[PDB]
């Protein structure tokens, strides 16, 4: 049906707008950018004026 085809096109448009694999990739890239490592030292005197 033409209505079914139009609904399928609209749903495909919504799904393309909602991939989110790039969102997960952005999160992983943010984690890689952070890449911290700490706590080998505990008592760290943060002497600040």
């Amino acid at each position: 049906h033409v209505e079914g085809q139009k609904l399928k096109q609209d749903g495909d448009s919504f799904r393309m707008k909602l991939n989110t694999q790039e969102i997960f990739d952005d999160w992983a890239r943010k984690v890689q950018q952070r890449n911290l490592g700490v706590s080998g030292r505990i008592f760290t005197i943060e002497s600040t004026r």
Binding site: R41, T44, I45, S47
Partner: peptide, 28 residues
Amino acid sequence: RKLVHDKELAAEDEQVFLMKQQSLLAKQ
């Protein structure tokens, strides 16, 4: 009677503690 003479009981100052701690951090 040997009055008092109780070693002048007092602790290191918190600023003095900060100084010694900064010294330790420099040693760290």
